[PDB]
Each structure stands twice: as structure tokens, then as C-alpha cells.
Design a protein around this ligand. Structure first.
Ligand SMILES: N=C(N)NCCC[C@H](NC(=O)CCC(=O)O)C(=O)O
Ligand SMILES: N=C(N)NCCC[C@H](NC(=O)CCC(=O)O)C(=O)O
Ligand SMILES: [K+]
Ligand SMILES: [K+]
Lengths: 440, 440
């Protein structure tokens, strides 16, 4: 008898728009706009707090060390931190952005989770995602591993595995391409791993990259010791990737017996839904036809990067980003879905404009971890969301986050200091110890 | 007053043909043929010994730990070494080959070298190549770094840098894409970094991959502290890459004031040669027209993956692979070049069939390191080629290397043991200590 616990990423203070993710249309379209770090973190914390107060287990995962000077050094720039910062700013300012992204905030890509009810050894397994496709994102893995081990520290209940080798052949984007269908969270579930490409397969996107490879997905399934009979691999529809769906969570989401997805989500969709129907009792596929919502509208509103939550009476709630309400067509469809006879009996909207401008909605900011009562108790209590942490995190944000930020500001030695201090204090607040590289 | 010292790779015991390198036509064409590890090693040692006896400073770099079980475990396969070996063999035998390749033998891709005469701090710099394009090759970096630090141990004379981050954006293939033109080895030289692609540049191969990126090349130049006025970056002709030239040393080679290269080697070749002529005193470009030798014949014979050595009297010798003599056209051209009035006054041919079948000729098996008398003296004496080491290495090969091997054999637990013991013995022979992962 376990519960699904949502772990959201606390937006970092270097949050900015750099258009680093080709294939992520929001990122590319918001290229150099001014960002609001303070506001970004605030928006995220409100969603966290809201869901928490609504009775949905909520926790937080802290931001990373940014700017990340170690990697700049690795790239040949030497001297003291400030000196490297200076040199890079004047010689290769584009790298500055690459090592100063608040991207780890999208914890949906942090790792892939395997609830103890689906593993061979009966433990909760978490495999860090290499995020190799995007350089700025590939830097997250090491620190993310340190953070996950600092939060899920009971090694008798949790097994954190290191990321797969950093090569395109094993591109892994984590939970964002993962799905879990079944009855109650606590019972053994059916894991659906979605991938973009595989060796020897000519079926693959031709305009935008397929960040996830089947080879990676299969390795993670092994690493997480997922029972072979509870795993299924499906290929994302290449056509929809070429339109902006860089992660499965941008065109489909699962929860309990329901798989809410667009009609053009997968290749051989009919075979997959039939397979799920036969392998998952009570399976309900809610397909949205291109007729009611175009893939284009899907990518801009992020109706599928929503959180599908279970209410105590079995009914479900759809957590959506504000742009879903601001789009007549999609909002109209969501309400039709709401009124229709199905599990979706409530719509909840949040303003996550800062995150959405970089291609991340409600789901992208959270990592679902199904935990038993005993496992829930073994999680670092300091990261569980509640009044105390909420007020503390908001005060922390007001003390260190700026209201405005631009790539140009990333060179400011002052920003570097504020960030180091902010993280130092945060590590104490969250009882993580010296988890960041700069603290060692 | 320094000398160029050639460091060759001692072929490993797991040498086999797996067709793992798309873009490397030899590798692809010899896909699953049976290999002869013992012979492979012997062929290479003969070339080493011959050049050594001819008066050309020669050294050796040992093979790596193969099969590399740690990576298989990182891929989700658990249990004892033999258990992992078994599971992988039966579940994903293709991985077995990826972690059992003797690829590190091609040390021309081991790192990028910067002789003390070209560095800002006056030291010899070596930056390990990430070899990120090919998974099987990308595994080399860590051990390669350990080996280079065990050979070039005098930290006051040598600076070994770690490989660039492992992402396509920074694909680095080392010295194979490097060149150095100037007067005497000991004088400051002009380094020419050849790359296949760069961000924002539409000019790039469309069939085969461009393993080297300008971004990487620029970073290595920084890492190696190369004087800015002694550096030039040039792009490989994308058309020639799409024909099998996956490394610059498959289409061009430099030595002293000479740059021996095919006419279609670089993009904007005329401007590059004019640039070199103006910046390098006595510069001599020896261009081979498509009319005399086709790109196709260039890739099959490897006339350009030859070693261009300087004889005591300033004249030069061309070390070529057997296939250059077995090809009427190329052989005819080499002799014409030999008879023509130029530095090339001698042709030397070696049988490197085992290495050639996987796309590597004379140059691919060696890493050129220009060292001063004092730096030469600081190199681990145990790896310098001479009668003692030659006889010892041959006996070592006779004791541990098989006469035949196939991908199927890579699962043999006996192969794994032979390899571990062979390496342990070699570490002692070469006085390298516990340099391999399995020894720690
Ligand atoms: N849907 C999920 N699970 N995650 C969305 C993350 C968006 C992120 N954008 C960025 O990293 C853009 C950064 C910039 O351009 O500033 C990405 O492309 O990986
Ligand atoms: N010219 C230089 N400097 N190096 C050539 C190395 C050949 C190597 N072959 C391989 O890795 C193929 C192994 C196989 O497929 O079994 C490569 O492709 O990178
Ligand atoms: K409903
Ligand atoms: K000649």
C-alpha cells in the first residue's frame, strides 16, 4: 500500500533563456528574452504547495551549482573562478550559458524510477539519466546522483544507479519517457518505456533529434531490476518528434489504469494500446484526435505535460499550465473531457510561464516516486513539502534570487557568489551536507 | 634540439572484427572475419622494431583491459565477472564486442600533443581524446589517461589533461586530426588542427559522420596551452569524409616543412596552403591530384596514413602499408613521387594487414611526441623500444595471445583470465604499476 510522491525541482537562481535545446521549440522561440529567476522559483513552489495542501505527497529537489566553473576549466579556461568567468565571458560567452542553465529544475529528466513493487530485489531503484543529447543538460548527472543519494539515503530501501555511458548510442532522458500503468500504486505495475530511435531502425525523426534510444531504455530497465514481464518498449511517433515533442511527456501521460495521449503519440499506436489493454486490467486509453487538438496546439499548450493525479475516491485531476486555459480550442477540449464520462473529474491550472518559456510544464518539474509507508519514512524528511519548508524556501528565494537576469549577467562575479552562498545555506536547510562540488 | 619520438600501440589480445565504425569502410567491409591477435601484435612490433633499428626513436603504449566488465555492469548486467560475461553473451552479445575491442591500439587517436617549444608554460602537454563518436572507442579515455600519466610521469616536464566532455558537440579524435609544420622539431612549430564540422556551419558530411568538431579542436588548443600565433584550424573536405576519410591522417600527413596530402583533402585547400606558405618558412605542399590517385584508391591503400620520417640528412622516408605496393596505380605514383625532385627519397613498406582490416595503417598505430633530450630522459625508460623490450614483448605475446579469435569467443571466461594475467605481467614489464581498473 504505497503512495505516489511528487518531487519537484526548485528553480535555480541562474534561470535564463539561451535557446540551447534544438527540438524544444519553446526554448528556441524564447531565445534571448529576459528571465525572472525569483518569479520562476516562486511559481514552482506555489504549484508544489497547492498540490501538497490538496493532499498529494510533495517533496523538493534543489537546484545545481551554477555557473559551473569546473567544466569551464575542463574546457581549457584557467585561473581563479572569477578569472575563468571573465575569460570565458570575453572569449566564449556561449559556454557561459551552457554551464549556467537552471535546466536541472526539470526533474522529470532527473532519473527513471522503479517502485519496490516492480523490482527483483524488492527495493526502490533510481537510475540517473545521462541527458547526453544536450551538452548543458549532460552536466547534471553527477550532481543529480549526489542529490538523489542525499534524499533517498536509506540504502536498504533505495538503490541509486549512476547514469549510462555518455554517448549518443545511449541517449537517456529519464522519467520523461517513462510510464507506469496498473491498479493501485502499491501493486506490481506495467512500465512503458518510450524511445525515439534505435540502431538498425530506419524509423526515426528527420528534423528534430530523438534524445532517447531503445538501447538506453533497455539498459535502464535492467539497472532498475524491473521484472521482465512488467516492461514494454514503444517507439515515439517520429512525425510528432519533428513537431516539437522532444519527450514523451509532451504528448502523453499515464496514471493508474489511464493513458491520456494524443492520437499521433506512438508509432503502431493501435498495437500498443491493444497490448496494454490485454496486459493491464482495467486499462483505459483516452486518445485525443488531431481533429479536436492539433499536434501544433499540443506543443504550444502542453496539455499533455500535465500531471494526472488520483483523488481519494479514484477520480482524477488534471494539473495544467495556464496556456491550456488561454487556448480556446484546448481549453474547450479539456472541459469536454472533464464533462465526459471518464476518470478525469477535475481541472486545476497553474501559472508556470517562466518554466513554460523554456519548454517545461507541470509534469516536467516533477519526478513521480511511488513509495510505501516505510519507504516514505526513509526519505530525507527535510525535503518534504509543508508550511515550514514552504515559508523557508520562499524566504531563501527572496534573499538570493534576482527579479531579472540575462545571459550578459552570467559573467557577473557577484552572481557567482550569491549562488554559492545560496546553495550552502540550502544544503543546511535541506540537511544534504556537502553535496555540491564547490563544497568539497 | 628535440627529436620526434614515435609511440606505437601494442595490439591487445581481444583484437577482432566487429564492424563497429560506420564511416570507416575497412571496419565495415571486414565485419565478422576471423582475426589473429597474436599476428596483429607481431606485425606492429616488427614495424616498431624496424623503425627503431633504423634510428627513429620508438616507444610502446600497452593495450587496455578487455573485455571491460565495468561498463557492462554500468549497462545493467550484474554478478561476478564471468556471470556478467555470460548474461551479456546470451542477452546482448553486441555489447560484448563494444567492450572487447582492441581499438586503443590506434594511439594516433589517443591524445593531442603539444611539444614544449609551442606551449606557454614551456611544458609538454598531452590532452586525451574523448573519442565520443564511437561508443567502443569512447571507453578508452580514462585508461588512456592513466597510461599516459604512467609513461610521461615527470610532472615538471609533462602535463596530461583529461578528455573533453563526452558529447557530440565536442567530438575529439586526437592527433589523427592534428598536424605540425615548421623547421627542426625542436623549434616552435605551426600546429594545424583539422576538424569535420562546427556549429552554425552548413558545410559538413552527409553520409559518414564528422567525428571531429572545431569546438573540440579549439578547446584542446587551449588545454595544451598552444601559443595562439602557432595555431591554425582547417575544415576537412566534407566530400572526402563521405568517401571514408574519417580522420585527417587518411588523406594527409605532415612532417617538418612538408604537408603530403590529396588534392581534395581540405575545404578551401588553396587558401590553406597559401596560408601555410606564408606562415611556415620553407613550407612544401605535395598535392596528389585525383587524376593520379582517386579518393577511392586513397582510402583502400592508405597511402596517406603513412609515416613521413626525417632522415639524418634532411631527406624523408615514407612508411607505407603493404596494400600500397599491391596497388599498381598507387605504387606507380609513390615511385614517381620517390623519383621526383623532393624530400621523399625512400619508401619503406610493412605488412599491417590485421590492423588495416579495421581501418588502421602505419600512422594510426603511432603517436608522435617531440621531446627534448632532457624530456626524452624523463619518459618511463621501460617503454622505449630496443632488443630487450622487443624480445620480451614477443615472448609475452607468444605466452598469452591466440592465433584465432571471433566475436563468439569474446564470451569465453578463459579469454578474460588470460587477458587479466597478461596485463598484470605487462604492467610489471613496463613498470606502470596498478594502472588498469581491474588492478585496483
Ligand atoms: N518535458 C520535460 N520533461 N522537460 C522539459 C525540459 C526543457 C529543457 N529546456 C532547456 O533546457 C532550454 C534551456 C535554454 O535554452 O535556456 C530541455 O530542452 O531539456
Ligand atoms: N586513422 C586513425 N588514426 N585511426 C583509425 C582507427 C580505426 C578504428 N577502427 C575501429 O574501431 C573498428 C573496429 C571494429 O569495427 O572491429 C576506428 O574506426 O576509429
Ligand atoms: K470526466
Ligand atoms: K623524391
Amino acid at each position: 500500500n504505497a503512495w505516489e510522491v511528487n518531487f519537484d525541482g526548485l528553480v535555480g537562481l541562474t534561470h535564463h533563456y539561451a535557446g540551447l535545446s534544438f527540438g524544444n521549440e519553446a526554448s528556441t522561440r524564447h531565445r534571448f528574452q529576459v528571465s525572472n529567476p525569483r518569479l520562476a522559483a516562486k511559481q514552482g513552489l506555489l504549484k508544489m504547495k497547492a498540490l501538497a495542501d490538496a493532499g498529494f505527497p510533495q517533496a523538493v529537489i534543489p537546484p545545481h551549482e551554477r555557473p559551473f566553473i569546473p567544466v569551464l576549466r575542463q574546457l581549457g579556461f584557467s585561473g581563479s573562478d572569477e578569472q575563468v568567468l571573465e575569460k570565458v565571458a570575453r572569449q566564449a560567452p556561449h559556454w557561459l550559458s551552457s554551464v549556467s542553465s537552471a535546466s536541472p529544475m526539470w526533474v522529470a529528466n532527473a532519473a527513471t524510477i522503479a517502485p519496490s513493487a516492480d523490482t527483483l530485489d524488492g527495493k526502490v531503484h533510481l537510475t540517473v539519466a545521462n541527458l547526453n543529447n544536450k551538452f548543458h543538460r549532460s552536466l547534471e548527472a553527477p550532481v543529480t546522483e549526489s542529490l538523489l543519494k542525499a534524499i533517498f539515503n536509506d540504502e536498504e530501501k533505495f538503490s541509486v544507479h549512476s547514469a549510462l555511458p555518455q554517448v549518443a548510442l545511449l541517449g537517456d532522458e529519464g522519467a520523461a519517457n517513462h510510464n507506469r500503468l496498473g491498479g493501485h500504486y502499491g501493486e506490481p505495475g506495467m512500465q512503458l518505456f518510450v524511445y525515439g530511435r534505435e540502431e538498425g531502425n530506419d524509423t526515426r525523426p528527420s528534423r528534430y533529434p530523438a534524445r532517447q534510444t531503445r538501447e538506453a531504455s533497455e539498459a535502464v530497465a535492467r539497472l532498475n531490476q524491473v521484472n521482465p514481464q512488467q516492461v514494454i518498449f514503444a517507439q515515439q511517433n517520429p512525425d510528432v518528434i519533428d513537431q516539437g515533442v522532444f519527450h514523451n511527456d509532451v504528448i502523453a501521460v499515464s496514471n493508474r489504469q489511464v493513458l491520456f495521449c494524443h492520437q499521433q503519440a506512438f508509432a503502431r499506436q493501435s498495437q500498443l494500446l491493444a497490448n496494454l489493454r490485454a496486459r493491464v486490467n482495467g486499462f483505459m486509453a483516452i486518445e485525443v484526435p488531431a481533429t479536436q487538438v492539433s499536434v501544433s496546439d499540443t506543443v504550444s499548450t502542453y496539455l499533455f505535460n500535465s500531471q494526472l493525479l488520483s483523488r481519494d475516491d479514484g477520480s482524477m485531476m488534471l494539473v495544467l499550465p495556464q496556456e491550456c486555459r488561454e487556448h480556446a480550442g484546448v481549453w474547450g477540449y479539456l472541459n469536454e473531457l472533464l464533462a465526459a464520462d471518464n476518470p478525469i473529474s477535475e481541472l486545476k491550472v497553474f501559472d508556470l510561464r517562466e518554466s513554460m518559456a523554456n519548454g517545461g510544464g507541470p509534469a516536467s518539474l516533477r519526478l513521480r516516486v511511488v513509495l510505501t509507508e516505510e519507504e516514505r519514512r526513509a526519505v530525507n524528511p527535510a525535503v518534504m513539502m509543508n508550511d515550514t519548508l514552504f515559508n523557508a524556501l520562499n524566504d531563501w528565494v527572496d534573499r538570493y534570487y534576482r527579479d531579472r537576469l540575462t545571459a550578459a549577467d552570467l559573467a557577473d562575479p557577484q552572481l557567482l557568489r550569491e549562488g554559492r552562498e545560496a546553495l550552502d545555506v540550502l544544503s543546511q536547510l535541506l540537511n544534504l551536507g556537502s553535496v555540491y562540488p564547490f563544497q568539497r
